[PDB]
Amino acid sequence: LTNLTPTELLANKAVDYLANSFLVETPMLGLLANRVINQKQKAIEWGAKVA
């Protein structure tokens, strides 16, 4: 009938989709990302001719 089927026992097959469309666009990161350097040291020293 129309009452002996409560929602508690009804497991609707979900669509295997998540609305995971958050703002992942990272152009600043995207540029100068494939060129990041992983130093075994911790300090970055270089020279600047200033005068």
Next chain:
Amino acid sequence: LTNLTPTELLANKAVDYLANSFLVETPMLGLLANRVINQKQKAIEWGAKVA
């Protein structure tokens, strides 16, 4: 004849032309139509990352 062909004995065969030119454009339906999903269940479950 002037009297020997009454209207009621003249068939007046019609041109086989039906004239329904009604609004039948369903472009919003046309979009997302050939990808309609016919579920065997009445419910539509999907996730949404909201945070």
